[PDB]
Amino acid sequence: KPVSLSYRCPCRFFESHVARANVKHLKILNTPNCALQIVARLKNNNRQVCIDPKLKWIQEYLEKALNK
């Protein structure tokens, strides 16, 4: 069977509404054949989700992470 395997990404979707208060750990994963995937694990849900870079607290996060 001819099967086309795409360049697999750690994320498929990105959460577009995440609470900083519910984030365990922030991890941003740039992937050579994929988009810029942000990864965060939830505290109350404890599941590791994906985050969209254009979130408001995320823009702040990137800015202040680069600023320090």
Swiss-Prot record:
Consequence of changing residue 25 to S: 55-fold reduction in binding affinity for Link domain of TNFAIP6
Outcome after substituting residue 1 to A: Loss of chemotactic activity
Site (Important for integrin interaction and activation): residue numbering on this chain: 24, 27, 43
Effect of mutating residue 7 to H: No significant effect on CXCR4 binding or activation
Binding site for heparin: 20-30, 41, 48, 64
Short motif Receptor activation motif, span: 1-2
Protein name per the record: SDF-1-alpha(3-67)
Organism listed in the record: Homo sapiens
Upper classification of the organism: Eukaryota, Metazoa, Chordata, Craniata, Vertebrata
Gene: CXCL12
